[PDB]
Amino acid sequence: LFIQPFWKLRSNGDNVVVGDKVILNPVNAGQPLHASNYELSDNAGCKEVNSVN
């Protein structure tokens, strides 16, 4: 997972600081992780995580 800046303050090559908002982009899939809004039927109140823009 490439760890990439989400803020314009940080830039490529900068050390990651605790508490920073970052984006995890899979090397192969190429689409950042995303917490879907589709509620899971098996467990109520639980969402899903999938790779998409």
Next chain:
Amino acid sequence: CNTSWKINLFMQFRDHLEEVLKGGDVVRLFHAEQEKFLTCDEYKGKLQVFLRTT
């Protein structure tokens, strides 16, 4: 004449480094998130500060 000149210190030689922020420096504030420069201009007879869209 009898005029006397008093030496008032504003900045020392050690603090005159070009790699640090110093009093009196002319710099502009750039908003990284919005990618806009801080600016102030007269709009309706009163000077107002804002970020200018480019």
